[PDB]
């Protein structure tokens, strides 16, 4: 009983202090003195490597998922006379489940792995320890502008993923296979409604932006300062975010959509 | 320190995120649990709503069956806000729209100038109507 | 360099604004809310009416439905509806019918006008109401 | 080698315009009329009006007048179809099961179409069969 | 401008062409040669743990999250016609055509794709690949060859676990929760799926996606610079290039077979 | 070794009690836990779209399933197999079986109609009063001719 | 090194048990049966929406499929093939060929009727047939 059979230990005390270390990392980086003019060039500088550089893997991949949504939405509606409802399948899928979940997996892959590697390289070269010595807090210097950049980028990148994926379905649905444009957009404009498809797409995009950025900034801060600890925390960022985006996707659909 | 300062924050943060999922998963007013007796429920099942006047007033808990009578029984529940119904209230199974889900309906009759409480049973009922016996008795 | 980071941020905000306008024009949002007055009417069976049900006179929607209330005395469905200020000239001889949009669509609260002339104002009832008939009494009345 | 780097630069740009020409190839005025329909049904804007079967135009935004409470069913027939006689009319035909309907002197400018045939709703059509 | 824009675009054209030339020579020098089935037999099972066994945790608990979301979204839009005999189609058909081998590949490129890049890149910085070729057989057929064959076996095998759990995960929101008479759930879902359209065709996409993911995951760790920042840079490029190779080939295989 | 005695063991009891979920098809109700059913037989003329695992219901409450559909090699008639549980035994010989449809894609089920009292049915009898399924090709053609 | 060999055996066992969940519970591919069937020949005049792999049936239970449907370019008559297995080889010569529909929105199948005796063998044609239902002629004959 005292050995590793029942009271094995290092599982209730361990992996619970890391939750307390992640809570103190976000509370001390968001609650403080208001410095708006100081963090104003830091927010624009940290918006290029978070929102602008992650726009490459969304535009060219938005037409990839948007075209296969129109390919698979054609042959399954042949014997049901649902050819005029071609935008019924493309728009409703890319606004409820596809979209804010698929872009969060691309945000955790590109921007999530880069934020872990950036803070992890600063602790390996002791940049955060040297910044702390010169009478300033390293928490509200590099973590706080990186958090607010990743929060406002993912809803601003989801609407790009939606509009490209809808246009990706228009290049394979309206141009190809001969479907009328008057019958296509009538199944999208006055068919779906507000507060179920538009607001709820932006509600879950904010909560996915907080959870991915909190994981990516904690693994880069709570890591071993060596050459193998940065590569280990980069792998654990994608694992912990894919189980948090897909895990909360079943949680967030309890209230909305029936 | 590093051990005492970070052990109590993880207690409150894990208890706040776990309690946020308890509220989000819809885990949160009395009824008097009426009982009925039909012969063909049709597409009725558990968690089916009961309506009067088109809008719903409650839900059906479960559908049981007695082995001595071999008839389906309903365990519907209507709340305390609507009580003044007579004993001649007819129960009818209606469909929401054309191909929607089926629901119960309370056809309130003429009140003679008794109320239903815990343990009562609606006498006048009308079961669901299948589309098999109607066409077989019309085009024949 | 330094000048490459400042320009590409504004292009990212412009591309996100044009992608949001594609949802504000070519999606469920078609436009870019004046207070109405509340009516009251008693029915017998509203069918499948819910919140924000469209009210139309001839086909053009003139308002929504706030909530569905009930009577604690006679147990009859009381529906509240809102008409705009521009559509004010409505007589008392009005049939409040409940029809559906097509065959499998959602139900809409229909309304038609009918020609000492009293018109409807804020806070009055309508005596001519047409209840939504369920599918049960259509085949049963056709046979009997 | 700087000489071989600029030699392949014009070779890749010649294939860029050829690969982009196959994707851009697949990616007239309208004079307005008038209609005085009573029951428009479930007809909305941007509906394909096919008088005879082939589409000729669309439908503008519908609204009710404050005088007689009647919807405006103004139309957008373009210039390729203009030899239509004045003894024509329009009819509201449905298409599908969701309720999406469509429509079917000189008429160059300001043509009030007479002999209006409104959309017969099925909720009132069952009263004729029952009574 | 004519001598400057053509020289800058011409410099990136040769470096792109030299990138594919080094990837072709790395795969050709790792598959052919003398048969070493008796020496690579303890090396293949050792590399089957961090590729197939360690990536089973990211698929099993996420498999019940895919089917619970897909089973709940595909129910309330099918109640307008018939609640019974639903959720057998549009769940098992979707998890064998688009979902399945695409979704498991983003979990394979994030967990196992980013780990195989960081493992070869860490051995290159610590001088392990150069030390092996200076005394023994070169590590192209010693550490790269068991890591390439382990990815083309585990990812077709892990897709079957992702399908069968996600099918059972869709049978939890339909059975014992808003039940749809689960006797109708079977003996009609089997009539929709068949061989060489849904079962064998799912295995075709699994073998193709396993090659294009493990090729970039073993090339970015081999072509990275031996430093602390080159391993973290090649780890980010592995998730980027594999997401464009899975979603890019998803349009290729859908228009060819379906 | 001081705090890993009872402050950690309360997480083991909390995870063991939360390690159980609802499972009607994984490992509980499919093979091990079942109900005792007796085998019945019924000979039909046209079953329509009747397949395996179809519910046999009296009014709508499912009391059994359907095992398989076999054909006799002498008269070529479909013979279904019933899976009525032992909780409902008082079934007379005057019971009739009616194949009713439920849906629009040709999904038919067996609606058992109990009789009024006779003899109690046992394991391995055959009900004679069987009704064929409704076909749309004979429904519209009877109205015209 | 024993930990890196046992867990691989559970990984190949869990991947094998996932294959039996698809090949048995999610589909029926457990038997190949080496195709024990024989083809026939038939000629209709209007097959309607009869497509490939059309399951023919005797009394509702499904056995036998349709392999090839061709059009004979001599008098514009379509020719279909039925592929019942070699088990129920007692078919009377008075058997007809009717085209039925599974319910309302199902697939269009072929129903075999039992007639009142030449036993049909491999390589013959069915004389007595029956066409499908035409939707434009019932609405024209109803008002005529
Ligand atoms: C009665 C027959 C019905 C049809 C049966 C055959 C259907 C076959 C469909 C399967 C093959 C095509 C699959 C296409 C891809 C589907 C994937 C998908 O839908 O998205 C899912 C989730 O599903 C959704 O996105 C929600 C879709 C909501 C659909 C809303 C209804 C659409 C209406 C179309 C039908 C129109 C109904 C009107 C009646 C007319 C037609 C009868 C993704 O889940 P995630 O967890 O986000 O994945 C993360 C990793 N990528």
Coordinates of N, CA, C and O in Angstrom, one line a residue, chain C:
Chain C
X1 N 13.7 43.3 -41.5 CA 13.6 44.8 -41.6 C 12.5 45.3 -40.7 O 11.8 44.5 -40.1
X2 N 12.3 46.6 -40.6 CA 11.3 47.2 -39.8 C 10.1 47.6 -40.5 O 9.0 47.5 -39.9
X3 N 10.2 48.1 -41.7 CA 9.1 48.6 -42.5 C 8.2 47.5 -43.0 O 7.0 47.8 -43.4
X4 N 8.7 46.3 -43.1 CA 7.8 45.2 -43.5 C 6.8 44.7 -42.5 O 5.8 44.2 -42.9
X5 N 7.1 44.9 -41.2 CA 6.2 44.5 -40.2 C 5.0 45.5 -40.0 O 3.9 45.0 -39.6
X6 N 5.2 46.8 -40.3 CA 4.1 47.7 -40.1 C 3.1 47.7 -41.2 O 1.9 47.9 -40.9
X7 N 3.5 47.5 -42.5 CA 2.6 47.5 -43.6 C 1.7 46.3 -43.6 O 0.5 46.3 -43.8
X8 N 2.3 45.1 -43.3 CA 1.6 43.8 -43.4 C 0.5 43.6 -42.3 O -0.3 42.8 -42.5
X9 N 0.6 44.4 -41.2 CA -0.5 44.3 -40.2 C -1.7 45.0 -40.7 O -2.8 44.4 -40.6
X10 N -1.6 46.1 -41.4 CA -2.8 46.8 -42.0 C -3.5 46.0 -43.1 O -4.7 46.1 -43.4
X11 N -2.7 45.2 -43.9 CA -3.2 44.4 -44.9 C -3.9 43.2 -44.3 O -5.0 42.7 -44.8
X12 N -3.4 42.7 -43.1 CA -4.1 41.6 -42.4 C -5.4 42.1 -41.8 O -6.4 41.3 -41.8
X13 N -5.5 43.3 -41.3 CA -6.7 43.9 -40.8 C -7.7 44.2 -41.9 O -8.9 44.2 -41.7
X14 N -7.2 44.5 -43.1 CA -8.1 44.8 -44.2 C -8.6 43.5 -44.9 O -9.8 43.5 -45.3
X15 N -7.8 42.5 -44.9 CA -8.3 41.2 -45.4 C -9.3 40.5 -44.4 O -10.2 39.8 -44.9
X16 N -9.1 40.8 -43.1 CA -10.1 40.3 -42.2 C -11.4 41.1 -42.2 O -12.5 40.6 -41.9
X17 N -11.3 42.4 -42.6 CA -12.5 43.2 -42.7 C -13.3 42.9 -44.0 O -14.5 42.9 -44.0
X18 N -12.6 42.6 -45.1 CA -13.3 42.2 -46.3 C -13.9 40.8 -46.2 O -14.9 40.5 -46.9
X19 N -13.2 39.9 -45.4 CA -13.8 38.6 -45.2 C -15.0 38.6 -44.3 O -15.9 37.8 -44.4
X20 N -15.0 39.6 -43.4 CA -16.2 39.8 -42.5 C -17.3 40.4 -43.3 O -18.5 40.1 -42.9
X21 N -17.1 41.2 -44.3 CA -18.1 41.8 -45.1 C -18.7 40.8 -46.1 O -19.8 41.0 -46.5
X22 N -17.9 39.8 -46.4 CA -18.5 38.7 -47.2 C -19.5 37.9 -46.4 O -20.5 37.3 -47.0
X23 N -19.4 37.8 -45.1 CA -20.4 37.2 -44.2 C -21.5 38.3 -43.9 O -22.7 37.9 -43.6
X24 N -21.2 39.5 -44.0 CA -22.2 40.6 -43.8 C -23.1 40.9 -45.0 O -24.1 41.6 -44.9
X25 N -22.7 40.3 -46.2 CA -23.5 40.5 -47.4 C -23.9 39.3 -48.1 O -25.1 39.1 -48.4
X26 N -23.1 38.3 -48.2 CA -23.4 37.0 -48.9 C -23.8 35.9 -48.0 O -23.9 34.7 -48.5
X27 N -24.1 36.2 -46.8 CA -24.5 35.2 -45.8 C -25.8 35.6 -45.1 O -26.5 36.5 -45.7
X28 N -26.1 35.0 -44.0 CA -27.3 35.3 -43.2 C -27.6 36.8 -42.9 O -28.7 37.2 -43.0
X29 N -26.5 37.5 -42.7 CA -26.6 38.9 -42.5 C -26.8 39.6 -43.9 O -25.9 39.3 -44.8
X30 N -27.8 40.3 -44.1 CA -28.1 41.0 -45.4 C -28.0 42.5 -45.3 O -27.8 43.2 -46.3
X31 N -28.2 43.1 -44.1 CA -28.2 44.5 -43.9 C -26.9 44.9 -43.0 O -26.1 44.0 -42.7
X32 N -26.8 46.1 -42.7 CA -25.7 46.6 -41.9 C -26.1 47.3 -40.6 O -27.1 46.8 -40.0
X33 N -32.8 49.1 -34.8 CA -34.0 48.5 -34.4 C -35.0 49.5 -33.7 O -34.8 49.8 -32.5
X34 N -35.9 50.0 -34.4 CA -36.9 50.9 -33.9 C -37.9 50.2 -33.0 O -38.3 49.0 -33.2
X35 N -38.3 50.8 -31.9 CA -39.2 50.2 -30.9 C -40.6 50.1 -31.5 O -41.2 51.0 -32.1
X36 N -41.2 48.9 -31.3 CA -42.6 48.6 -31.8 C -43.5 48.5 -30.6 O -43.1 48.4 -29.4
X37 N -44.8 48.4 -30.9 CA -45.9 48.2 -29.9 C -46.3 46.8 -29.9 O -46.2 46.0 -30.8
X38 N -46.8 46.4 -28.7 CA -47.1 45.0 -28.4 C -48.6 44.8 -28.5 O -49.4 45.5 -27.9
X39 N -49.0 43.7 -29.2 CA -50.4 43.3 -29.4 C -50.7 42.1 -28.5 O -49.8 41.5 -27.9
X40 N -52.0 41.8 -28.4 CA -52.4 40.6 -27.7 C -53.6 39.9 -28.4 O -54.5 40.6 -28.9
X41 N -53.5 38.6 -28.5 CA -54.5 37.8 -29.2 C -54.6 36.4 -28.6 O -53.5 35.9 -28.3
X42 N -55.8 35.9 -28.5 CA -56.0 34.5 -28.0 C -56.3 33.6 -29.1 O -57.1 33.9 -30.0
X43 N -55.7 32.4 -29.1 CA -55.9 31.4 -30.1 C -56.4 30.1 -29.5 O -56.7 30.1 -28.3
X44 N -56.4 29.0 -30.3 CA -56.8 27.7 -29.8 C -55.7 26.7 -29.9 O -55.5 25.9 -29.1
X45 N -54.9 26.8 -31.0 CA -53.7 25.9 -31.2 C -52.8 26.7 -32.1 O -53.1 26.9 -33.3
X46 N -51.6 27.0 -31.6 CA -50.6 27.8 -32.4 C -49.7 26.8 -33.2 O -48.9 27.3 -34.0
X47 N -49.8 25.5 -33.0 CA -49.0 24.6 -33.8 C -47.6 24.5 -33.4 O -47.3 24.1 -32.3
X48 N -46.7 25.0 -34.2 CA -45.3 25.0 -33.9 C -44.6 26.4 -33.9 O -43.5 26.5 -34.3
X49 N -45.4 27.3 -33.4 CA -44.9 28.7 -33.2 C -43.9 28.8 -32.1 O -44.1 28.2 -31.0
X50 N -42.8 29.6 -32.3 CA -41.8 29.7 -31.3 C -41.4 31.2 -31.2 O -42.1 32.1 -31.8
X51 N -40.3 31.5 -30.6 CA -39.8 32.9 -30.5 C -39.3 33.4 -31.8 O -38.8 32.6 -32.6
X52 N -39.4 34.7 -32.0 CA -39.0 35.4 -33.3 C -39.7 34.8 -34.5 O -39.0 34.6 -35.5
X53 N -41.0 34.6 -34.4 CA -41.7 34.1 -35.5 C -42.1 35.2 -36.4 O -42.5 36.3 -35.9
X54 N -42.0 35.1 -37.7 CA -42.2 36.3 -38.6 C -43.7 36.6 -38.8 O -44.5 35.6 -39.0
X55 N -44.1 37.8 -38.7 CA -45.5 38.3 -38.9 C -45.5 39.0 -40.2 O -44.7 40.0 -40.4
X56 N -46.3 38.6 -41.1 CA -46.4 39.2 -42.5 C -47.8 39.5 -42.9 O -48.7 38.7 -42.6
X57 N -47.9 40.5 -43.7 CA -49.2 40.9 -44.3 C -49.0 40.8 -45.8 O -48.6 41.8 -46.4
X58 N -49.4 39.7 -46.4 CA -49.2 39.4 -47.8 C -47.9 38.8 -48.2 O -47.8 38.3 -49.3
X59 N -46.9 38.8 -47.3 CA -45.7 38.2 -47.6 C -44.5 39.0 -47.1 O -43.4 38.4 -46.8
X60 N -44.6 40.3 -46.9 CA -43.6 41.2 -46.4 C -43.6 41.1 -44.9 O -44.7 41.4 -44.3
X61 N -42.5 40.8 -44.3 CA -42.4 40.7 -42.8 C -42.5 42.1 -42.2 O -41.8 43.0 -42.6
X62 N -43.3 42.2 -41.2 CA -43.5 43.5 -40.5 C -43.1 43.4 -39.0 O -43.2 44.4 -38.3
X63 N -42.6 42.3 -38.6 CA -42.2 42.2 -37.2 C -42.0 40.7 -36.8 O -42.1 39.8 -37.6
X64 N -41.7 40.6 -35.5 CA -41.4 39.3 -34.9 C -42.4 39.0 -33.8 O -43.3 39.7 -33.5
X65 N -42.1 37.8 -33.1 CA -42.9 37.4 -32.0 C -42.0 37.4 -30.7 O -41.0 36.7 -30.7
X66 N -42.5 38.1 -29.7 CA -41.6 38.2 -28.5 C -41.7 37.0 -27.7 O -40.6 36.3 -27.5
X67 N -42.8 36.6 -27.2 CA -42.9 35.4 -26.3 C -44.3 34.8 -26.4 O -45.3 35.5 -27.0
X68 N -44.5 33.6 -26.0 CA -45.8 32.9 -26.0 C -46.2 32.7 -24.5 O -45.5 32.0 -23.8
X69 N -47.3 33.3 -24.1 CA -47.8 33.3 -22.8 C -49.1 32.4 -22.8 O -49.6 31.9 -23.8
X70 N -49.6 32.1 -21.6 CA -50.8 31.3 -21.4 C -51.7 31.9 -20.4 O -51.3 32.8 -19.6
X71 N -52.9 31.5 -20.4 CA -54.0 32.0 -19.5 C -54.1 31.1 -18.3 O -54.3 29.9 -18.4
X72 N -53.9 31.7 -17.1 CA -54.1 30.8 -15.9 C -55.5 30.6 -15.4 O -55.8 30.0 -14.4
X73 N -56.5 31.1 -16.2 CA -57.9 30.9 -15.9 C -58.7 30.0 -16.9 O -59.3 29.0 -16.5
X74 N -58.6 30.3 -18.2 CA -59.3 29.6 -19.2 C -58.4 28.6 -20.0 O -58.9 27.8 -20.7
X75 N -57.1 28.8 -19.8 CA -56.0 27.9 -20.4 C -56.1 28.0 -22.0 O -56.4 27.0 -22.7
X76 N -55.9 29.2 -22.5 CA -55.9 29.4 -23.9 C -54.5 30.1 -24.3 O -54.0 30.9 -23.5
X77 N -54.0 29.8 -25.5 CA -52.7 30.4 -25.9 C -52.8 31.8 -26.2 O -53.6 32.2 -27.1
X78 N -52.1 32.7 -25.6 CA -52.0 34.1 -25.8 C -50.7 34.5 -26.4 O -49.7 34.3 -25.8
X79 N -50.7 35.0 -27.7 CA -49.5 35.3 -28.4 C -49.3 36.8 -28.5 O -50.3 37.5 -28.7
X80 N -48.1 37.3 -28.3 CA -47.8 38.7 -28.4 C -47.0 38.9 -29.7 O -46.1 38.1 -30.1
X81 N -47.3 39.9 -30.4 CA -46.8 40.2 -31.7 C -46.6 41.7 -31.9 O -47.2 42.5 -31.2
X82 N -45.6 42.1 -32.8 CA -45.2 43.5 -32.9 C -45.3 43.9 -34.4 O -44.7 43.2 -35.3
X83 N -46.0 45.0 -34.6 CA -46.1 45.6 -36.0 C -45.3 46.9 -35.9 O -45.3 47.6 -34.9
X84 N -44.7 47.3 -37.1 CA -44.0 48.5 -37.2 C -44.9 49.7 -37.2 O -46.1 49.6 -37.4
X85 N -44.3 50.9 -37.0 CA -45.1 52.2 -36.9 C -45.6 52.6 -38.3 O -46.6 53.3 -38.4
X86 N -44.9 52.1 -39.4 CA -45.4 52.5 -40.7 C -46.7 51.8 -41.1 O -47.5 52.3 -41.8
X87 N -46.8 50.5 -40.6 CA -48.0 49.8 -40.9 C -49.0 49.9 -39.7 O -49.1 49.1 -38.8
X88 N -49.7 51.1 -39.7 CA -50.6 51.4 -38.6 C -52.0 51.4 -39.0 O -52.9 51.2 -38.1
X89 N -52.4 51.6 -40.2 CA -53.8 51.6 -40.7 C -54.2 50.2 -40.9 O -54.1 49.6 -42.0
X90 N -54.7 49.6 -39.8 CA -55.3 48.2 -39.9 C -56.7 48.2 -39.3 O -56.9 48.8 -38.2
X91 N -57.7 47.7 -39.9 CA -59.1 47.7 -39.4 C -59.2 46.6 -38.3 O -58.3 45.8 -38.1
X92 N -60.4 46.5 -37.7 CA -60.7 45.5 -36.7 C -61.1 44.2 -37.4 O -60.9 43.1 -36.7
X93 N -61.6 44.2 -38.6 CA -62.0 43.0 -39.3 C -60.7 42.4 -39.9 O -60.4 42.6 -41.1
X94 N -59.9 41.7 -39.1 CA -58.7 41.1 -39.6 C -58.6 39.6 -39.1 O -58.8 39.4 -37.9
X95 N -58.4 38.7 -40.0 CA -58.3 37.3 -39.7 C -56.8 36.9 -39.4 O -56.0 37.0 -40.3
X96 N -56.6 36.5 -38.2 CA -55.3 36.1 -37.8 C -55.1 34.6 -38.0 O -55.4 33.8 -37.2
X97 N -54.5 34.3 -39.2 CA -54.3 32.9 -39.6 C -52.8 32.5 -39.3 O -51.9 33.4 -39.3
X98 N -52.6 31.2 -39.1 CA -51.3 30.7 -38.9 C -51.0 29.7 -40.0 O -51.6 28.6 -40.1
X99 N -50.1 30.1 -41.0 CA -49.7 29.2 -42.1 C -48.3 28.9 -42.0 O -47.5 29.6 -41.3
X100 N -47.8 28.0 -42.8 CA -46.4 27.6 -42.9 C -45.8 28.1 -44.2 O -46.5 28.4 -45.1
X101 N -44.5 28.2 -44.1 CA -43.7 28.7 -45.3 C -43.4 27.5 -46.2 O -42.5 26.7 -46.0
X102 N -44.3 27.3 -47.2 CA -44.1 26.2 -48.1 C -44.9 25.0 -47.6 O -46.1 25.0 -47.3
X103 N -44.1 23.9 -47.4 CA -44.7 22.6 -46.9 C -44.0 22.1 -45.7 O -44.6 21.7 -44.7
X104 N -42.6 22.2 -45.7 CA -41.8 21.7 -44.5 C -41.1 22.8 -43.8 O -40.3 22.6 -42.9
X105 N -41.4 24.1 -44.1 CA -40.8 25.2 -43.5 C -41.4 25.6 -42.2 O -42.3 25.0 -41.7
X106 N -40.9 26.6 -41.6 CA -41.4 27.1 -40.3 C -42.7 27.9 -40.5 O -42.9 28.5 -41.5
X107 N -43.5 27.9 -39.5 CA -44.8 28.6 -39.5 C -44.6 30.1 -39.3 O -43.8 30.5 -38.5
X108 N -45.4 30.8 -40.0 CA -45.4 32.3 -39.9 C -46.8 32.8 -39.5 O -47.8 32.2 -40.0
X109 N -46.9 33.8 -38.7 CA -48.2 34.4 -38.3 C -48.7 35.3 -39.4 O -48.3 36.4 -39.6
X110 N -49.7 34.7 -40.2 CA -50.2 35.5 -41.3 C -51.3 36.5 -40.8 O -51.9 36.3 -39.8
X111 N -51.5 37.5 -41.7 CA -52.5 38.5 -41.3 C -53.0 39.2 -42.6 O -52.2 39.5 -43.5
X112 N -54.3 39.4 -42.7 CA -54.9 40.1 -43.8 C -55.9 41.2 -43.3 O -56.5 41.0 -42.2
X113 N -56.0 42.3 -44.0 CA -56.9 43.4 -43.6 C -58.2 43.2 -44.3 O -58.3 42.6 -45.4
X114 N -59.2 43.8 -43.7 CA -60.6 43.8 -44.3 C -61.3 45.1 -44.2 O -61.4 45.6 -43.1
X115 N -61.8 45.6 -45.3 CA -62.6 46.8 -45.3 C -64.0 46.6 -44.8 O -64.5 45.5 -44.6
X116 N -67.7 55.7 -38.4 CA -67.6 54.7 -37.3 C -66.6 53.6 -37.6 O -66.8 52.5 -37.3
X117 N -65.4 54.0 -38.2 CA -64.4 53.1 -38.6 C -63.3 53.1 -37.4 O -62.6 54.1 -37.2
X118 N -63.2 52.0 -36.7 CA -62.3 51.8 -35.7 C -61.0 51.1 -36.2 O -61.2 50.0 -36.8
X119 N -59.9 51.6 -35.9 CA -58.6 51.0 -36.3 C -57.9 50.4 -35.0 O -58.2 50.8 -33.9
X120 N -56.9 49.6 -35.3 CA -56.2 49.0 -34.2 C -55.0 49.9 -33.7 O -54.3 50.5 -34.5
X121 N -54.8 49.9 -32.4 CA -53.8 50.7 -31.8 C -53.0 49.9 -30.8 O -53.1 48.7 -30.8
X122 N -52.1 50.5 -30.1 CA -51.3 49.8 -29.1 C -52.1 49.3 -27.9 O -52.6 50.1 -27.2
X123 N -52.2 48.0 -27.8 CA -52.8 47.5 -26.6 C -54.3 47.1 -26.7 O -55.1 47.3 -25.8
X124 N -54.7 46.4 -27.8 CA -56.1 45.9 -28.0 C -56.0 44.5 -28.4 O -55.0 44.0 -28.9
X125 N -57.2 43.8 -28.4 CA -57.3 42.4 -28.7 C -57.9 42.3 -30.1 O -58.5 43.2 -30.7
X126 N -57.8 41.1 -30.7 CA -58.4 40.8 -32.0 C -59.3 39.6 -31.8 O -58.9 38.5 -31.3
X127 N -60.6 39.7 -32.2 CA -61.6 38.7 -32.0 C -61.7 37.7 -33.1 O -62.1 36.6 -32.8
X128 N -61.2 38.0 -34.3 CA -61.2 37.1 -35.4 C -59.8 36.4 -35.5 O -58.9 37.0 -36.1
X129 N -59.7 35.2 -35.0 CA -58.5 34.5 -35.0 C -58.7 33.1 -35.7 O -59.7 32.4 -35.3
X130 N -57.8 32.7 -36.5 CA -57.9 31.4 -37.2 C -56.8 30.5 -36.6 O -55.6 30.7 -36.8
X131 N -57.2 29.4 -35.9 CA -56.3 28.5 -35.3 C -55.6 27.6 -36.3 O -56.2 27.3 -37.3
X132 N -54.4 27.2 -36.0 CA -53.6 26.3 -36.8 C -54.1 24.9 -36.6 O -54.0 24.3 -35.5
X133 N -54.7 24.3 -37.6 CA -55.3 23.0 -37.5 C -54.1 21.9 -37.7 O -53.2 22.1 -38.5
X134 N -54.2 20.9 -36.8 CA -53.2 19.9 -36.8 C -53.5 18.8 -37.8 O -54.6 18.9 -38.5
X135 N -52.6 17.9 -38.1 CA -52.8 16.9 -39.2 C -53.8 15.8 -38.8 O -54.2 15.1 -39.7
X136 N -54.3 15.8 -37.6 CA -55.2 14.7 -37.2 C -56.6 14.9 -37.7 O -57.2 13.9 -38.1
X137 N -57.1 16.1 -37.6 CA -58.5 16.4 -38.0 C -58.7 16.7 -39.5 O -59.7 17.2 -39.9
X138 N -57.7 16.5 -40.3 CA -57.8 16.6 -41.7 C -58.3 15.3 -42.4 O -59.2 15.3 -43.2
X139 N -57.6 14.2 -42.1 CA -58.0 12.9 -42.7 C -59.2 12.4 -41.9 O -60.1 11.8 -42.6
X140 N -59.3 12.7 -40.6 CA -60.5 12.2 -39.9 C -61.8 12.9 -40.2 O -62.9 12.3 -40.2
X141 N -61.7 14.2 -40.6 CA -62.9 14.9 -41.1 C -63.2 14.6 -42.6 O -64.3 14.7 -43.0
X142 N -62.2 14.1 -43.3 CA -62.4 13.7 -44.7 C -63.1 12.4 -44.8 O -64.0 12.2 -45.7
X143 N -62.8 11.5 -43.9 CA -63.5 10.2 -43.9 C -64.9 10.3 -43.2 O -65.9 9.8 -43.7
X144 N -65.0 11.1 -42.1 CA -66.2 11.3 -41.4 C -66.6 12.8 -41.4 O -66.0 13.5 -40.6

